[PDB]
mmCIF file of C-alpha atoms and ligand atoms in Angstrom:
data_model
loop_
_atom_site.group_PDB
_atom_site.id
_atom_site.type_symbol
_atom_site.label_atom_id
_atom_site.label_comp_id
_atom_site.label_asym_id
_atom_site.label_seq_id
_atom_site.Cartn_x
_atom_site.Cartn_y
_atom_site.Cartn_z
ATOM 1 C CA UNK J 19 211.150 -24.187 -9.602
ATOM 2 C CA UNK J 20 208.138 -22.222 -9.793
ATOM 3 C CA UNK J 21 207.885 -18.518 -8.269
ATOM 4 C CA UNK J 22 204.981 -16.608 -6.250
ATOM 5 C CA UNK J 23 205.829 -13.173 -4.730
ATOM 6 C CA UNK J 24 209.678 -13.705 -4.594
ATOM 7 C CA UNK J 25 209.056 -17.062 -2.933
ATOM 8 C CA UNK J 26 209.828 -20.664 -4.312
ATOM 9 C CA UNK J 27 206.492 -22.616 -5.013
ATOM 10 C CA UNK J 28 208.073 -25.947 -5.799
ATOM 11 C CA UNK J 29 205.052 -28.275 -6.538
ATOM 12 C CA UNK J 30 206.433 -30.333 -8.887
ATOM 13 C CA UNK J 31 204.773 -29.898 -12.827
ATOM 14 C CA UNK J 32 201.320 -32.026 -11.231
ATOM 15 C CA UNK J 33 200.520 -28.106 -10.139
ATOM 16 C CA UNK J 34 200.862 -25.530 -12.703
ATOM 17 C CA UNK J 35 199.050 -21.834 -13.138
ATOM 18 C CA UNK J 36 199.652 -20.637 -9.834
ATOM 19 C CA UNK J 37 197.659 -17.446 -8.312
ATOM 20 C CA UNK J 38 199.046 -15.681 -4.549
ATOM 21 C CA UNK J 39 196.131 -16.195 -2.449
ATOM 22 C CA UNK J 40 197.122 -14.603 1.254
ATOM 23 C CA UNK J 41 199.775 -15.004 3.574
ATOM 24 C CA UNK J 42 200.612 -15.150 7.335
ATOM 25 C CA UNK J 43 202.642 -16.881 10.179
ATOM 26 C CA UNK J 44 202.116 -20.011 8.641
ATOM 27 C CA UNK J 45 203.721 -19.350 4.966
ATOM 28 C CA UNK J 46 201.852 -18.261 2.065
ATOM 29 C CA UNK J 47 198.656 -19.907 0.197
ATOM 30 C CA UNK J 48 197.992 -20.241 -3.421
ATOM 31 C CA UNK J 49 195.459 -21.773 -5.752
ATOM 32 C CA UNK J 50 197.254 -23.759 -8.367
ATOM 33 C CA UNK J 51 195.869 -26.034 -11.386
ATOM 34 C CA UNK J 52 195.898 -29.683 -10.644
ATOM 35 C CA UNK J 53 197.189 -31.375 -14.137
ATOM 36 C CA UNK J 54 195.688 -35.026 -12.746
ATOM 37 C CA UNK J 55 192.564 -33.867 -11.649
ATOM 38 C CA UNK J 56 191.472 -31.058 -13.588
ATOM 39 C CA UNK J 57 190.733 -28.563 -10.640
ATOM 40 C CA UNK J 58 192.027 -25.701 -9.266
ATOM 41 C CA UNK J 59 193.214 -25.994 -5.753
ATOM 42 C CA UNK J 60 194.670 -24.643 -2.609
ATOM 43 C CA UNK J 61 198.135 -25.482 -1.813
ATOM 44 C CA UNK J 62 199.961 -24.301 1.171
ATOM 45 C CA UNK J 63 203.666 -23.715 1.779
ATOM 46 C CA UNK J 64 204.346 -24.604 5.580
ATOM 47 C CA UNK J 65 207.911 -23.407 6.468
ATOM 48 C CA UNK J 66 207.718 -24.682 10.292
ATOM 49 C CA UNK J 67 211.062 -25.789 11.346
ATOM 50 C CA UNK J 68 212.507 -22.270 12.995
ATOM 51 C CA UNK J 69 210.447 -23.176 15.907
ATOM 52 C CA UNK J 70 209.119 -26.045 17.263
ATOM 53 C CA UNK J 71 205.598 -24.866 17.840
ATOM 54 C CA UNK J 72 204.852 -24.565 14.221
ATOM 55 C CA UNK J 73 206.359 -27.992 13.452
ATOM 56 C CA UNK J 74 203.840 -29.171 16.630
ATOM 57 C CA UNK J 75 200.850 -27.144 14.394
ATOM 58 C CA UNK J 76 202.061 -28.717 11.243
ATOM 59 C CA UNK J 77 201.997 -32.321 12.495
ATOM 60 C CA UNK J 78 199.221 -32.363 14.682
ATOM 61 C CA UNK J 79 197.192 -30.558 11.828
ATOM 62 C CA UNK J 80 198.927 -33.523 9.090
ATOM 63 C CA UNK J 81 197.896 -36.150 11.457
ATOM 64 C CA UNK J 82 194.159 -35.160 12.129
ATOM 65 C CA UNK J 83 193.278 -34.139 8.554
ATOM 66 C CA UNK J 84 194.353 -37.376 7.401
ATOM 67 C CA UNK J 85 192.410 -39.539 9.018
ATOM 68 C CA UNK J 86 189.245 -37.286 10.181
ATOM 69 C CA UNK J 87 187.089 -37.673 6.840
ATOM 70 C CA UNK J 88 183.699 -35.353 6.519
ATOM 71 C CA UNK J 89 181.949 -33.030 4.477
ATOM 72 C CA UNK J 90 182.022 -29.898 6.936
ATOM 73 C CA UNK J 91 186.109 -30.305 7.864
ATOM 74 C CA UNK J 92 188.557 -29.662 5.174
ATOM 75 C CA UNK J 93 190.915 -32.387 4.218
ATOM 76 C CA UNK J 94 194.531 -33.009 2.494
ATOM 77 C CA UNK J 95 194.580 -34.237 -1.037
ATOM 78 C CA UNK J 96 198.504 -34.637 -1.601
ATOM 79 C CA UNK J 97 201.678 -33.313 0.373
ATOM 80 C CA UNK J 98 204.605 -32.205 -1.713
ATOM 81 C CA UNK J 99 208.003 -32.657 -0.409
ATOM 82 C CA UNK J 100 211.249 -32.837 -1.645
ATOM 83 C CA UNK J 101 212.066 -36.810 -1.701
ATOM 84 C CA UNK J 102 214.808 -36.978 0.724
ATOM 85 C CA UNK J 103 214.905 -35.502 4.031
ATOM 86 C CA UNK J 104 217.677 -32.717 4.212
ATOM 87 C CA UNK J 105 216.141 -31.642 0.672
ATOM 88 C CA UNK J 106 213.442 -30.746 2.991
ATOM 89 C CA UNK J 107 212.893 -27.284 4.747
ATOM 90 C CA UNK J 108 209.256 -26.656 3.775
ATOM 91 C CA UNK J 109 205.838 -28.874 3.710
ATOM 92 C CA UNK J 110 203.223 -28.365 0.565
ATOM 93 C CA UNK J 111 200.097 -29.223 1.959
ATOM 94 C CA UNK J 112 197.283 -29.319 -1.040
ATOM 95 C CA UNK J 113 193.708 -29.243 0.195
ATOM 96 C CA UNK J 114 190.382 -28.200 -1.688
ATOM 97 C CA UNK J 115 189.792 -24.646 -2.965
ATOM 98 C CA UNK J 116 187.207 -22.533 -1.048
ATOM 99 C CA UNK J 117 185.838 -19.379 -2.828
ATOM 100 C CA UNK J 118 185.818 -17.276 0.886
ATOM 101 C CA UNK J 119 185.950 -17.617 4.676
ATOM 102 C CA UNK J 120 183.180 -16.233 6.747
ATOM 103 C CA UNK J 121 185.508 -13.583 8.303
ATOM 104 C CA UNK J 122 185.664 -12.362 4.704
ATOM 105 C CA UNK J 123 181.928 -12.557 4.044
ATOM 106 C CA UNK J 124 180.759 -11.102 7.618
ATOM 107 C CA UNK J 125 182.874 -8.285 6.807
ATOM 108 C CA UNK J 126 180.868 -7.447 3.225
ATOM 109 C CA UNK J 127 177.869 -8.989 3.443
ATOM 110 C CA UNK J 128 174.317 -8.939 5.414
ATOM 111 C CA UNK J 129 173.378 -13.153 6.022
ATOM 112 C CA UNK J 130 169.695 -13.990 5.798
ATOM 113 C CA UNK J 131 168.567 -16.051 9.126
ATOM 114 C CA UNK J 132 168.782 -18.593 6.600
ATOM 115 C CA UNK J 133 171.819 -18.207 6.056
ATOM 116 C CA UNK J 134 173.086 -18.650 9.299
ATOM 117 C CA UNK J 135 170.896 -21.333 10.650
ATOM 118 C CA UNK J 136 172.677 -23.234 7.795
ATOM 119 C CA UNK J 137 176.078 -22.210 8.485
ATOM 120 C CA UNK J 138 175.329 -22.915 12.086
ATOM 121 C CA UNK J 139 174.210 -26.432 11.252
ATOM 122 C CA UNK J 140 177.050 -27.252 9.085
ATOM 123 C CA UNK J 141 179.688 -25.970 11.927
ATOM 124 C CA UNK J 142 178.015 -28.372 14.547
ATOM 125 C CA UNK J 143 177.523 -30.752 12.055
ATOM 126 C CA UNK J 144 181.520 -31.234 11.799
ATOM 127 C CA UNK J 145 182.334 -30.461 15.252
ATOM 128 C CA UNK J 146 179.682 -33.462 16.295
ATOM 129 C CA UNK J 147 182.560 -35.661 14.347
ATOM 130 C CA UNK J 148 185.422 -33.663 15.690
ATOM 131 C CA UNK J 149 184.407 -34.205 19.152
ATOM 132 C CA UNK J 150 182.995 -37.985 18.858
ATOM 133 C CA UNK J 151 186.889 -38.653 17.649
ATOM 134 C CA UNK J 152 187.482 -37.278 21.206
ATOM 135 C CA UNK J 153 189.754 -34.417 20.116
ATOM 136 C CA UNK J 154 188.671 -30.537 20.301
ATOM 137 C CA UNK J 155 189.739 -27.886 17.900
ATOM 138 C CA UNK J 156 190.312 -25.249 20.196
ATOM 139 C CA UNK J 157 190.349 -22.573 17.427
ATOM 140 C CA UNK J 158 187.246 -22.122 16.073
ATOM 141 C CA UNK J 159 186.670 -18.742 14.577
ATOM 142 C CA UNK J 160 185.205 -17.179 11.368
ATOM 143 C CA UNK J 161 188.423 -17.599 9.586
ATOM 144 C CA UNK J 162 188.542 -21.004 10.318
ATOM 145 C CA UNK J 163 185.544 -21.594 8.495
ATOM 146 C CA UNK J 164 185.687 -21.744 4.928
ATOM 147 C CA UNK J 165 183.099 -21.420 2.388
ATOM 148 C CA UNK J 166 182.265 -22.427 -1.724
ATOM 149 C CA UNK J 167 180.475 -20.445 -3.824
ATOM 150 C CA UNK J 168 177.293 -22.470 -2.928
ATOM 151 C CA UNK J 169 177.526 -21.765 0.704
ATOM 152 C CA UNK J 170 178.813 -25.251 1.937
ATOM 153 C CA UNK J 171 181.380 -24.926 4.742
ATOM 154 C CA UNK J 172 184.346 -26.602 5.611
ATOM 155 C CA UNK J 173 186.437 -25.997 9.266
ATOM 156 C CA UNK J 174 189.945 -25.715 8.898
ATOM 157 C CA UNK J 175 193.332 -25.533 10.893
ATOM 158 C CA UNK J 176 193.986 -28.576 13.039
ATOM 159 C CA UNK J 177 197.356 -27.452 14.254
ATOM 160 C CA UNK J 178 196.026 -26.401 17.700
ATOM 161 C CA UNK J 179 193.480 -29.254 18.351
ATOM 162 C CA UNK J 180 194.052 -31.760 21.597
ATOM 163 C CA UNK J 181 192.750 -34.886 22.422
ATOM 164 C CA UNK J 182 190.137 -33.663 25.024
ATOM 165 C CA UNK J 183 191.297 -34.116 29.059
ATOM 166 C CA UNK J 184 188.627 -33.363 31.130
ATOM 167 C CA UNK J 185 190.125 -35.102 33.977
ATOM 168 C CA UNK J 186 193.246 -32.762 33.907
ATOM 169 C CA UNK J 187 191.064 -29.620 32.798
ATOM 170 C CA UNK J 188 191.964 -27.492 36.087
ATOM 171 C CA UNK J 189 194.321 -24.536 36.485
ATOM 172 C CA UNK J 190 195.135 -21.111 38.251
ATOM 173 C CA UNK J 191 193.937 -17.666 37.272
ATOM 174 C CA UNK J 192 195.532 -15.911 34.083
ATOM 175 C CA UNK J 193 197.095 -18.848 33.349
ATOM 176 C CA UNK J 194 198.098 -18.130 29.400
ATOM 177 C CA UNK J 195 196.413 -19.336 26.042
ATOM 178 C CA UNK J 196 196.506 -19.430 22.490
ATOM 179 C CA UNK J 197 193.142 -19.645 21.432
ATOM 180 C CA UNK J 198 191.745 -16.751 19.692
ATOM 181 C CA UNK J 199 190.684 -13.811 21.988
ATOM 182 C CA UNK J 200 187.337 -12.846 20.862
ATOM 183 C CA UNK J 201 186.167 -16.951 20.954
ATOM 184 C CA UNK J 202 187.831 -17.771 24.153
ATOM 185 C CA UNK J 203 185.606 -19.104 26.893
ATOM 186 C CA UNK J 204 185.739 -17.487 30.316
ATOM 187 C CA UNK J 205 186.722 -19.997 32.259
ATOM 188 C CA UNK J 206 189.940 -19.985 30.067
ATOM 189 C CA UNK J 207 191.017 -17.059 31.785
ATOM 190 C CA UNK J 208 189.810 -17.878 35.357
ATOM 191 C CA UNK J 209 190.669 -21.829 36.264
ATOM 192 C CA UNK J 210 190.924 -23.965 32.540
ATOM 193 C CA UNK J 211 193.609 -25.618 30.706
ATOM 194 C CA UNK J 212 190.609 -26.055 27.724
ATOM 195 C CA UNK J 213 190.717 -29.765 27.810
ATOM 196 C CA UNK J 214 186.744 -29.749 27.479
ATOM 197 C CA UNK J 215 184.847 -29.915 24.497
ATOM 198 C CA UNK J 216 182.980 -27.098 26.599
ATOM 199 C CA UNK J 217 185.414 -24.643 24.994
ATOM 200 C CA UNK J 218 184.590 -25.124 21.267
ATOM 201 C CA UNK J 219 180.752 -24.742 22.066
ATOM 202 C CA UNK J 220 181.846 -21.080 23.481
ATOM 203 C CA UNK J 221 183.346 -20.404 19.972
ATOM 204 C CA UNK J 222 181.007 -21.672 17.897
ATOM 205 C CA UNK J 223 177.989 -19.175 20.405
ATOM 206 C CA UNK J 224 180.410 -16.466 19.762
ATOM 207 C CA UNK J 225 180.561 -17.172 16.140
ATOM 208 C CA UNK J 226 176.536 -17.159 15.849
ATOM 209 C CA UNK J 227 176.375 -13.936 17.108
ATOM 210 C CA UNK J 228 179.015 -12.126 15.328
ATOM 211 C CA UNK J 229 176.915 -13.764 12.401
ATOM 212 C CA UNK J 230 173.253 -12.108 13.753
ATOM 213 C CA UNK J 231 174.737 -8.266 13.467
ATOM 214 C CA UNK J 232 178.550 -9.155 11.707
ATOM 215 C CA UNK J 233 180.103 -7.189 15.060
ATOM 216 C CA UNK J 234 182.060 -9.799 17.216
ATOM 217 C CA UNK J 235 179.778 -10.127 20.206
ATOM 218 C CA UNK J 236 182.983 -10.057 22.841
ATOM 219 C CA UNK J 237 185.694 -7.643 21.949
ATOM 220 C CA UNK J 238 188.214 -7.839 23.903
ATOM 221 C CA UNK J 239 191.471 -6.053 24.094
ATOM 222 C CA UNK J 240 193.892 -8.063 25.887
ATOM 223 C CA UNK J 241 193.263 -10.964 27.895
ATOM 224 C CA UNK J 242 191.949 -9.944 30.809
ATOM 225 C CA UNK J 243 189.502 -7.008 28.671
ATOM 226 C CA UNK J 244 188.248 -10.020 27.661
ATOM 227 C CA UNK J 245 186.273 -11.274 30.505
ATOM 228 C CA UNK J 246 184.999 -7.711 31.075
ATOM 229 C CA UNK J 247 183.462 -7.695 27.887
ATOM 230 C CA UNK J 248 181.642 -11.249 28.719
ATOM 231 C CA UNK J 249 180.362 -10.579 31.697
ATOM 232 C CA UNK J 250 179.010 -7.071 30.166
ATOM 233 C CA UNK J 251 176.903 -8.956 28.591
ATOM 234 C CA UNK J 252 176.318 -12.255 30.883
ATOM 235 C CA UNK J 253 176.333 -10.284 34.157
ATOM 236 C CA UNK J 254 177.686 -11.242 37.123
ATOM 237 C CA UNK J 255 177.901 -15.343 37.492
ATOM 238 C CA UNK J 256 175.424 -16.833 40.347
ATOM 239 C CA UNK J 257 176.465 -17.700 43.598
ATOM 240 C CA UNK J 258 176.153 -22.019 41.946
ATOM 241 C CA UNK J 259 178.265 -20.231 39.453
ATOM 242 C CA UNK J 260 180.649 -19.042 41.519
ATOM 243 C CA UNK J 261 180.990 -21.690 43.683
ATOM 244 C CA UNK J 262 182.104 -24.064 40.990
ATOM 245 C CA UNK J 263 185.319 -21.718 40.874
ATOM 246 C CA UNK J 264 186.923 -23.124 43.957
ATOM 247 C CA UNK J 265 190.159 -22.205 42.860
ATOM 248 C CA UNK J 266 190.570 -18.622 45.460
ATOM 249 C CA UNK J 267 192.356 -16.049 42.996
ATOM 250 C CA UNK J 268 190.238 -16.636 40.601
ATOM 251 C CA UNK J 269 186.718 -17.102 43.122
ATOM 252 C CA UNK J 270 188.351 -13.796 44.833
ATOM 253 C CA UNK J 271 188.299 -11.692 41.396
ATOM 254 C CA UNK J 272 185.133 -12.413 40.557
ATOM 255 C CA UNK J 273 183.668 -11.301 44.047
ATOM 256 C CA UNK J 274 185.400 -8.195 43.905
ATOM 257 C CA UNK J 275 183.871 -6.755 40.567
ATOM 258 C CA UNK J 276 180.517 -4.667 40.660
ATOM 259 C CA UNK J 277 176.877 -6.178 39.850
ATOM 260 C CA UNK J 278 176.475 -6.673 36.435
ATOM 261 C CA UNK J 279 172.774 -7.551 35.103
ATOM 262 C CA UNK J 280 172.798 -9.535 31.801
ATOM 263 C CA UNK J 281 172.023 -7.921 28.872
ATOM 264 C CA UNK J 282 168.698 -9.503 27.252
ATOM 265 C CA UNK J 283 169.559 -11.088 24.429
ATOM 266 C CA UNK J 284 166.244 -10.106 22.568
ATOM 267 C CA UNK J 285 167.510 -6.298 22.796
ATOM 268 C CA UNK J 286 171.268 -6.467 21.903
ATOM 269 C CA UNK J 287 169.728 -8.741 18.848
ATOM 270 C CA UNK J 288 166.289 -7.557 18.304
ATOM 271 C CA UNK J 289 166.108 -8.396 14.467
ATOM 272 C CA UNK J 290 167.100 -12.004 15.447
ATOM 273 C CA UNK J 291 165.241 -15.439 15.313
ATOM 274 C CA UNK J 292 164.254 -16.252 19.073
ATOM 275 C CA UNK J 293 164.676 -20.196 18.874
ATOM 276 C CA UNK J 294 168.324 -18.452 17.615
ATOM 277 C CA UNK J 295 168.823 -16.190 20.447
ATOM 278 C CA UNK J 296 167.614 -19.677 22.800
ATOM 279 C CA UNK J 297 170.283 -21.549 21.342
ATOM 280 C CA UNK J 298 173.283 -18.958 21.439
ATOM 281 C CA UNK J 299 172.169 -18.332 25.428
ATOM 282 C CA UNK J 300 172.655 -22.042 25.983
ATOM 283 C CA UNK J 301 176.038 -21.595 24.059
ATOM 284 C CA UNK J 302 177.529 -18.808 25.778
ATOM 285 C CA UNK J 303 176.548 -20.242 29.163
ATOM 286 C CA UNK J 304 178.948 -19.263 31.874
ATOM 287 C CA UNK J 305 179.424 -22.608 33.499
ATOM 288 C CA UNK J 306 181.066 -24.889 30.980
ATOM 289 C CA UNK J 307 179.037 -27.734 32.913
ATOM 290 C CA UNK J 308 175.869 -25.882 32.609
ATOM 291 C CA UNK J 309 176.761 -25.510 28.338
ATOM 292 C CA UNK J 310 174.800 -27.157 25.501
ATOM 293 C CA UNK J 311 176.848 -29.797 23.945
ATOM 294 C CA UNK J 312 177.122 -30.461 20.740
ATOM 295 C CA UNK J 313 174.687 -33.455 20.151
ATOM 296 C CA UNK J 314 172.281 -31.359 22.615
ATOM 297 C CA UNK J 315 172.749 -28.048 20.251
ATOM 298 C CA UNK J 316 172.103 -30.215 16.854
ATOM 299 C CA UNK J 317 168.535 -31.108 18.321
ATOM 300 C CA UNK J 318 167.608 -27.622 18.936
ATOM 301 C CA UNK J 319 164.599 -26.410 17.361
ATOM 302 C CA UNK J 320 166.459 -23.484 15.667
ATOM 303 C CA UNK J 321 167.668 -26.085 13.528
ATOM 304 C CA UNK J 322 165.148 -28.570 13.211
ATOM 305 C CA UNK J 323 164.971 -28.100 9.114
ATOM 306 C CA UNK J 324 168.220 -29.881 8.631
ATOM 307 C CA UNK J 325 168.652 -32.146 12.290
ATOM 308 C CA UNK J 326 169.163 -35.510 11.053
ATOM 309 C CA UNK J 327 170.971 -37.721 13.432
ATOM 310 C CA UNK J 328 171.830 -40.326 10.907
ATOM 311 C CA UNK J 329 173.197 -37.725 8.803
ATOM 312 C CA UNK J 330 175.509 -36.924 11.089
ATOM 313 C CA UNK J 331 178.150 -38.945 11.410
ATOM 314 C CA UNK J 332 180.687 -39.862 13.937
ATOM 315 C CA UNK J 333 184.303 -40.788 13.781
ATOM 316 C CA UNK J 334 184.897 -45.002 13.334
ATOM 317 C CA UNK J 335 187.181 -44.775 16.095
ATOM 318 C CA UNK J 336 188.541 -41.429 18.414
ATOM 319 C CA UNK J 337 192.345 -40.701 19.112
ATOM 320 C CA UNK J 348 212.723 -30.538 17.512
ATOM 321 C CA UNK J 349 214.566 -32.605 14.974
ATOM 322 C CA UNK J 350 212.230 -36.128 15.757
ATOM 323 C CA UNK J 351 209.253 -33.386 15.301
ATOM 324 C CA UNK J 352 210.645 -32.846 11.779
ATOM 325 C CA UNK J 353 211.360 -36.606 11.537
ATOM 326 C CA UNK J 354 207.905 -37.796 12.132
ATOM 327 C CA UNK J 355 206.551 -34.686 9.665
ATOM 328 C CA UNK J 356 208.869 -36.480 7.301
ATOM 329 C CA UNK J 357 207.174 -39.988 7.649
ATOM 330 C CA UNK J 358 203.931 -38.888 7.903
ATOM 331 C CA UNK J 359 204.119 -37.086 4.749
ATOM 332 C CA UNK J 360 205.739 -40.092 2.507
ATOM 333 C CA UNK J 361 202.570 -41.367 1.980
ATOM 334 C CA UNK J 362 202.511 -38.948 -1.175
ATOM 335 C CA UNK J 363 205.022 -39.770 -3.017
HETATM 336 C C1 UOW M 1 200.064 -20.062 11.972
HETATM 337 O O1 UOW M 1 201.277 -20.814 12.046
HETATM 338 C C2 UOW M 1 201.284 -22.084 11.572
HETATM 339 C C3 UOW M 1 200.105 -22.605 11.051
HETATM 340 C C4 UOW M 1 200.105 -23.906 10.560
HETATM 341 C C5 UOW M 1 198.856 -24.553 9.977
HETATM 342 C C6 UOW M 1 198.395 -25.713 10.850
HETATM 343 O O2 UOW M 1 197.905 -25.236 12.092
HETATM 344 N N1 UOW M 1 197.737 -23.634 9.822
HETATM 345 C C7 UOW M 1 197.363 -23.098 8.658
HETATM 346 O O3 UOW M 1 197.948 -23.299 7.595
HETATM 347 C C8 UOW M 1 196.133 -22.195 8.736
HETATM 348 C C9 UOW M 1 196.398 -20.930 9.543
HETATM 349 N N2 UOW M 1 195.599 -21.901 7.410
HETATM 350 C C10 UOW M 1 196.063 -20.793 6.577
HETATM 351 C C11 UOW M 1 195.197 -20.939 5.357
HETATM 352 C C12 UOW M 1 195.110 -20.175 4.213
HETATM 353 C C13 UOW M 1 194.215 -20.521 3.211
HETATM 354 C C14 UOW M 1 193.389 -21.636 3.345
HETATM 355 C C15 UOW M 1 192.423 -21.990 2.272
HETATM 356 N N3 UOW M 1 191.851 -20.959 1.649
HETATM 357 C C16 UOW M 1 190.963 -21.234 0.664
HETATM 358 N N4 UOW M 1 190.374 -20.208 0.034
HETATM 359 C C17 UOW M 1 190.507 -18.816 0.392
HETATM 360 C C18 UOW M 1 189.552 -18.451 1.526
HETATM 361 C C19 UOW M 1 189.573 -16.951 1.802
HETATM 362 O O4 UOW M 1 189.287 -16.192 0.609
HETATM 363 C C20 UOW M 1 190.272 -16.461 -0.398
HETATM 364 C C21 UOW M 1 190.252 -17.923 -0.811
HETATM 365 N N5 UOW M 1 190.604 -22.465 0.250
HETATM 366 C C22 UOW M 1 191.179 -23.477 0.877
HETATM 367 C C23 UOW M 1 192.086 -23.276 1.893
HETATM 368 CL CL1 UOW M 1 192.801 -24.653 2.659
HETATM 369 C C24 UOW M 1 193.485 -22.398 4.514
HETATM 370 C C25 UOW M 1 194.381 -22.045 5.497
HETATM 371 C C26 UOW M 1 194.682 -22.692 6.792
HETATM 372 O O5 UOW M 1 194.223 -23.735 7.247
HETATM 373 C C27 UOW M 1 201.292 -24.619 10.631
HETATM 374 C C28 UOW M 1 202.411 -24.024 11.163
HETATM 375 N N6 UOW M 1 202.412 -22.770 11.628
#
């Protein structure tokens, strides 16, 4: 086989020339040459089995990138894996290569308003096809979003994304979660499941202004420092607010905090656009009812060089060893 950083990188001969990339829970990530099409790309070694909530990430993320197709969400351009099925402990997953991410670049570089009303744009633009197919990523963060040297941006990881359940969206108070910390929406912590496509428009507000002054605008901690920090900024919630929360612990905490006034947006970002600063406040709204949605956020005048509905498109139609089983047969498709 080939060899990485002590580590087996078994992509056949089709991949050859490989360079380490990063690493993390997931496995490790290199860019390889691709012998049949004459690019260099990403490949991915997925070692999920161990535990079944990586195999969950591995085929929920297999199923979704395979049949979403659009510009702004990255996609799967082969799987490698050995051809029978005990042969098989890890997953190859080859996508396209991206030159950064934007937690990367906000962590080097100044963005022009420009910039980010583009970026912006291009992260609604997929996540109006995300959510038309009726499923929400539920992990949307600058490392999420990847970007080519031209600035064109791609969301990635569909490993935590659920078919959206606003029906059953209703819970009790610090009731756990696995979204990201910094992008999770209050009500997460207080009385939702995040079953609402509500949750991803928090992210993506939180994600505009960490792009206005490259700080994260909330952050948090631990979980519950992470409400503190949003309603430092949003104040205390109204009385309609609050009585929206009808579940009592989490009704009852709220009450019991001091006043907070919100913090205008114009002086916590007073070198930012205004029609920005009138879009993020619709964003990071504290009643996921009251939030912009993502159709809504599109039209916004902030973003009215680009908004083209009909260049937008929508989805043609929405959504443990049998875990590894069905990773196994969704995957033979490749071979
Ligand atoms: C965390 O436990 C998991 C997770 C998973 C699965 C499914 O949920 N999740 C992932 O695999 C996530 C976390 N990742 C990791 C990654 C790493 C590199 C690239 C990549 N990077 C680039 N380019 C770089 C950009 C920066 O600057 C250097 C170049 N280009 C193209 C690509 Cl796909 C994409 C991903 C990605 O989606 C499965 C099981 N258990």
């Amino acid at each position: 086989p080939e060899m990485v950083r002590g580590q087996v990188f078994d992509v056949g001969p089709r991949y050859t020339n490989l360079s380490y990339i990063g690493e993390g829970a997931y496995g490790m990530v290199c860019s390889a040459y691709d012998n049949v099409n004459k690019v260099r790309v990403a490949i991915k070694k997925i070692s999920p089995f161990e535990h079944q909530t990586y195999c969950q990430r591995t085929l929920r993320e297999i199923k979704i990138l395979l049949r979403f197709r659009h510009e702004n969400i990255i996609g799967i351009n082969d799987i490698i894996r050995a051809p029978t099925i005990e042969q098989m402990k890890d997953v190859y997953i080859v996508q396209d290569l991206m030159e950064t991410d934007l937690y990367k670049l906000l962590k080097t570089q100044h963005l022009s308003n420009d910039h980010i009303c583009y970026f912006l744009y291009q992260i609604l633009r997929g996540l109006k096809y995300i959510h038309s197919a009726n499923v929400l990523h539920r992990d949307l963060k600058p490392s999420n979003l990847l970007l080519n040297t031209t600035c064109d941006l791609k969301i990635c990881d569909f490993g935590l994304a659920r078919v959206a359940d606003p029906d059953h969206d209703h819970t009790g108070f610090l009731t756990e979660y696995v979204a990201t910390r910094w992008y999770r929406a209050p009500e997460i912590m207080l009385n939702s499941k995040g079953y609402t496509k509500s949750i991803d428009i928090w992210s993506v507000g939180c994600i505009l202004a960490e792009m206005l002054s490259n700080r994260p605008i909330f952050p948090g901690k631990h979980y519950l420092d992470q409400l503190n920090h949003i309603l430092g900024i949003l104040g205390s919630p109204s009385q309609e607010d609050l009585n929206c929360i009808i579940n009592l612990k989490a009704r009852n905490y709220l009450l019991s905090l001091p006043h907070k006034n919100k913090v205008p947006w114009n002086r916590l970002f007073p070198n930012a656009d205004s029609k920005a600063l009138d879009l993020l406040d619709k964003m990071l709204t504290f009643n996921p009812h009251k939030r912009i949605e993502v159709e809504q956020a599109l039209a916004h005048p902030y973003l009215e060089q680009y908004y083209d509905p009909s260049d937008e498109p929508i989805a043609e139609a929405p959504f443990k060893e049998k875990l590894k089983e069905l990773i196994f047969e969704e995957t033979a498709r490749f071979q």
